[PDB]
């Protein structure tokens, strides 16, 4: 069950419930000492080590539990330094570098003077509970300089940390809940990373070998399907240029309703393929007076200045500044813009070099025009683009599921670690 009512409560290190007892980390832990670094100049201290030596890095590169070590140390190195074999299921706390970064070592390890080996008193304080506690106040802990005297964290300072100490049974309960949440977030995060890997492989595969082919040939753009041809952007698209109507005239921006896309609007896309709105808009007067190029919906827009290589497909007609270039197809019956938007993202590094051919990176109109591209049959272009865009969508739905779970953890974590909700026992 879940204790709904909060009843009355104390108030020392914050609103704490009756049962809770604000205790000092040192009073509930049987050992809070820092590690040490054996004379790195001595080979006999590391030469074929058996004791995993933990550094600030090892903790940061660990997800809650520490099970791997980058470097090792032997008995001699150990005995000839301030490092000590920390018992399993303990809690490591980084005092320098990554202030607040905590973890639970699953294997006996040693640490340098940066990491702090902490051992909770048996049946007095759970390591699991301690982990989630030091995590909730991780940001608050790291903040120990902007206050007055900038100081990282001393072994004596951490020992004086005032943390809430609920019944041993509740500590296991609360920690079990947060542990389940964390595992969920881990499962989703693993599918996201794998799907992003598949997506990357699909980009290379599909855009070079297409789909459904068994015959290929050489070409100016490498091995490609036999049914595919090669051309230049100029051959299939018309390249349009943009401009920025004087900022001195309101007649150009006041209540603007025509999109005016800048490379900044594109960078904010976050890999999204479609763009249907711009931060700042221009008016019909600006369009005719400044003779801006208006490209229809379905056109391709790409940044040629500043962050070069950002590409999108317009969902609504729009104009754009000199920081971009537009691509309009000769006939919208032999080309799918989404496919080419993807092809261009795929060749971002290539476009980046063409422009970086000097100071002030700019992708000239000739550069874009002469850029070589594949020309698959319209139908295959739709197929390859449906696949790429459907996977991109899947990745996004997953990231959104992770986000809601991470927010939910942040919520529940706030309620359980305090006097709000509790477990039945």
UniProtKB/Swiss-Prot annotation:
Outline the segment boundaries, as ranges, of region: Target recognition domain 2. 209-368
Q: What keywords would UniProt list here?
A: Coiled coil, DNA-binding, Restriction system
User: So which domain of life are we looking at?
Assistant: Archaea
**SUPFAM superfamilies referenced in this protein's UniProt entry, alphabetically:** DNA methylase specificity domain (SSF116734)
Q: Which GO terms describe its molecular function?
A: DNA binding
| CDD domains the record matches | RMtype1_S_EcoJA69PI-TRD1-CR1_like (cd17273), RMtype1_S_MjaORF132P-TRD1-CR1_like (cd17275)
Region (Central conserved region (CCR)) residue ranges read: 169-208
Q: What is this protein called?
A: Type I restriction enzyme MjaVII specificity subunit
Protein species of origin:
Methanocaldococcus jannaschii (strain ATCC 43067 / DSM 2661 / JAL-1 / JCM 10045 / NBRC 100440)
Region described as Target recognition domain 1: spans on this chain: 9-168
The similarity comment for this entry is: Belongs to the type-I restriction system S methylase family.
Instruction: Decide whether keyword Coiled coil is in the record.
Output: yes
Subunit-structure text: The type I restriction/modification system is composed of three polypeptides R, M and S.
Domain comment in the entry: Contains two target DNA recognition domains (TDR), each specifying recognition of one of the two defined components of the target sequence. The TDRs show high structural similarity and each forms a globular structure. The two TDRs are separated by 2 long, conserved antiparallel helices that form a coiled coil structure. These conserved regions may act as a molecular ruler for the separation between the two recognized DNA sequences.
Q: Which residue ranges does the record annotate as region Distal conserved region (DCR)?
A: 369-418
Q: Which residues form a coiled coil?
A: 169-208, 369-418
């Amino acid at each position: 069950m879940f204790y709904k009512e909060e009843n009355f409560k104390k108030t020392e290190i914050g609103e704490i419930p009756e049962d809770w007892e604000i205790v000092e980390l040192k009073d509930v832990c049987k050992k809070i000492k820092a590690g040490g670094t054996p004379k790195t100049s001595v080979e006999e201290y590391y030469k074929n080590g058996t004791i995993p030596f933990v550094k600030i890095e090892d903790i940061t590169n660990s997800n809650k539990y520490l099970t791997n070590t980058k470097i090792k140390i032997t008995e001699e190195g150990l005995n000839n330094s301030n490092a000590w074999i920390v018992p399993k299921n303990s809690v490591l706390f980084a005092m320098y570098g990554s202030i607040g970064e905590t973890a639970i070592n699953k294997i006996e390890v040693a640490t340098n003077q940066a990491i702090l080996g902490i051992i909770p008193k048996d049946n007095i304080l759970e390591s699991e509970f301690l982990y989630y506690i030091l995590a909730k106040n991780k940001n608050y802990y790291s903040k120990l300089g902007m206050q007055t005297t900038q100081k990282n964290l001393n072994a004596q300072i951490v020992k004086s940390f005032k943390i809430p100490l609920p019944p041993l049974e509740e500590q296991k309960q609360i920690a079990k809940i947060l542990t389940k949440i964390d595992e969920g977030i881990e499962i989703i995060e693993k599918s996201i990373n794998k799907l992003e890997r598949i997506k990357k492989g699909l980009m290379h595969k599909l855009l070079t070998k297409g789909i459904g082919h068994s015959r290929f040939k050489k070409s100016e753009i490498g091995e490609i399907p036999e049914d595919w041809e090669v051309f230049e952007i100029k051959d299939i698209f018309e390249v349009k240029t943009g401009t920025t109507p004087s900022t001195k005239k309101s007649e150009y921006w006041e209540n603007g309703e025509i999109n005016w896309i800048t490379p900044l609007d594109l960078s904010r896309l976050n890999e999204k393929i479609y763009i249907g709105s711009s931060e700042r808009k221009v008016t019909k007067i600006a369009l005719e007076k400044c003779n801006l190029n208006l490209i229809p919906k379905g056109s391709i827009i790409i940044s040629t200045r500043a962050p070069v290589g950002y590409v999108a497909v317009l969902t609504v007609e729009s104009t754009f500044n000199q920081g971009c270039k537009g691509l309009f197809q000769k006939n919208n019956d032999s080309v799918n813009t989404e496919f080419y938007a993807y092809y261009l993202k795929f060749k971002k590094n290539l476009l980046e070099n063409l422009s970086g051919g000097s100071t002030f990176k700019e992708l000239s109109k000739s550069m874009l025009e002469n850029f070589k591209i594949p020309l698959p049959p319209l139908e295959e272009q739709k197929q390859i683009a449906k696949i790429l865009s459907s996977v991109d969508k899947s990745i996004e739905l997953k990231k959104q599921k992770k986000e809601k779970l991470q927010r939910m953890k942040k919520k529940i974590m706030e309620l359980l670690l305090t006097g709000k909700v509790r477990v039945k026992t």
